[PDB]
């Protein structure tokens, strides 16, 4: 079911097996990098049940600070090989760039799992140039690149926010408005696993 779907929840405690398999996964985790919002510990990140979401596909993993290293560890533990890295050059509305150096970019790791086939590798290039909006906000350009890469396929986003909801995407995040599910297979497995519609423990 192509129109946006989403589940407000704690990605720590949701049983993500009911959601099926995905050709693309994106995550923008609240890495614990010191100093806001609720973060997750390195072990919580390590324990996230990413491995079930895919069999053959791609992982897109926003990293910053020490998460440049930690994300490479989570990405490897979860069973992916890092095969690319996208950087988003943050600009203003007139196309100028916004510890030891000032940061003009955000990094998103690209990982692969299994042998994914039919993907349009090489349509886009590993640099995004896009205007910065709210804090902690993804540039919409990344969804276009992921669409060209894998058109039509089912995609899931972890730690999204309301603006992030997109066609072909199931958005998980604890700041979304309730539950909105249209894929019948998912609706089914959700009614089975969560007969009273609450997600705990």
């Amino acid at each position: 079911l192509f129109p946006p779907q989403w589940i407000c929840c704690d990605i720590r405690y949701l049983d993500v097996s009911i959601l099926g398999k995905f050709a693309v996964v994106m995550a923008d985790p609240p890495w614990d990098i010191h100093m806001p919002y609720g973060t997750l510990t390195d072990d919580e990140m390590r324990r996230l049940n990413i491995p079930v979401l895919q069999d053959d596909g791609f992982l897109f993993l926003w990293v910053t600070g020490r998460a440049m290293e930690l994300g490479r560890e989570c990405l490897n533990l979860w069973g992916y090989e890092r095969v690319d890295e996208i950087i988003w050059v943050k600009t203003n509305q007139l196309q100028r760039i916004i510890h030891w150096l000032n940061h003009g970019k955000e990094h998103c790791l690209v990982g692969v799992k299994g042998n994914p086939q039919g993907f349009n590798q090489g349509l886009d290039c590993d640099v995004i140039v896009a205007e910065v909006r709210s804090t902690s906000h993804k540039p919409d350009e990344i969804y276009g690149m992921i669409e060209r890469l894998s058109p039509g396929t089912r995609k899931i986003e972890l730690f999204g926010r309301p603006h992030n909801v997109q066609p072909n995407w199931i958005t998980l995040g604890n700041q979304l408005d309730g539950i909105h599910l249209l894929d019948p297979d998912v609706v089914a497995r959700f009614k089975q696993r969560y007969p009273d519609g609450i997600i705990s423990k």
Binding site: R82, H99, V112, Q121, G122, C125, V129
Partner: protein
């Protein structure tokens, strides 16, 4: 305006459309005055005991010739066995050109092998205004990463220039500006430099160098008291 879509449309990489790519000049003068004379040694680094390079360096710029730069090469197998820790000052810095593939991961293994932690990830973003394929690649690779490691106790992390001509393997000279504006000390080693990278304030050691002038004793003479702890951004001592 979507510049990724524009790139799929026209071949102009999104970085082509970044525009604009005081006293931060007199600091360049201070660097200039405190710079040691250029020094340089031809050496086959595979076959060369790195310990004979003394004293211990405050900065190391490591630019191994990757096979990916061509489309003698060094694999990450070879890079990881260099005993960089044996020539690095207890407090010191490293800048490792990692390319754009596995080196982004293997260069991190290296930095940790030698005792550094990475505090900056400097990206060289190659525009293609003048000219609008790894199997594992998912996207077209249009950048290279220089990783910055520290051990012990003004600028952006971006260098935007036009992609060099095929077979030109030279890294942007701007990396030296970024390094030197940090004022990290005056013992600066550039490993796998070339004749064309030789620069004042730097010891260059490479296999393609065609002349040498290195003398360990003469090199150490530049940093004997009262000059041993200068940042390279201060005035000379009278």
């Amino acid at each position: 305006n979507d510049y990724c879509q524009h790139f799929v449309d026209t071949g102009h990489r999104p970085q082509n459309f970044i525009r604009d790519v005081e006293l931060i000049r007199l600091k360049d003068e201070l660097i200039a005055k405190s710079n040691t004379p250029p020094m340089y040694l031809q050496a086959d680094i595979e076959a060369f005991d790195i310990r004979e390079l003394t004293p211990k360096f405050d900065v190391i710029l490591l630019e191994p010739p990757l096979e990916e730069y061509y489309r003698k090469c060094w694999t990450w197998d070879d890079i990881m066995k260099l005993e960089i820790d044996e020539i690095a000052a207890p407090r010191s810095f490293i800048f490792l050109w990692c390319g754009s593939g596995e080196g982004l991961d293997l260069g991190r293994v290296c930095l940790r092998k030698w005792g550094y932690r990475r505090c900056e990830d400097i990206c060289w973003i190659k525009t293609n205004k003048n000219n609008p394929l790894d199997p594992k690649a998912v996207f077209q690779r249009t950048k290279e990463h220089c990783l910055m490691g520290i051990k012990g106790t003004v600028d952006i992390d971006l260098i935007i220039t036009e992609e060099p001509e095929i077979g030109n393997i030279e890294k942007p000279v701007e990396i030296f500006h970024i390094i030197e504006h940090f004022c990290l000390g005056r013992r600066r080693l550039h490993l796998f430099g070339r004749d064309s990278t030789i620069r004042p304030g730097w010891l260059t050691v490479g296999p393609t160098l065609t002349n040498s002038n290195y003398n360990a004793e003469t090199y150490a003479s530049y940093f004997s008291a009262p000059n041993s702890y200068l940042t390279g951004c201060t005035e000379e001592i009278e």
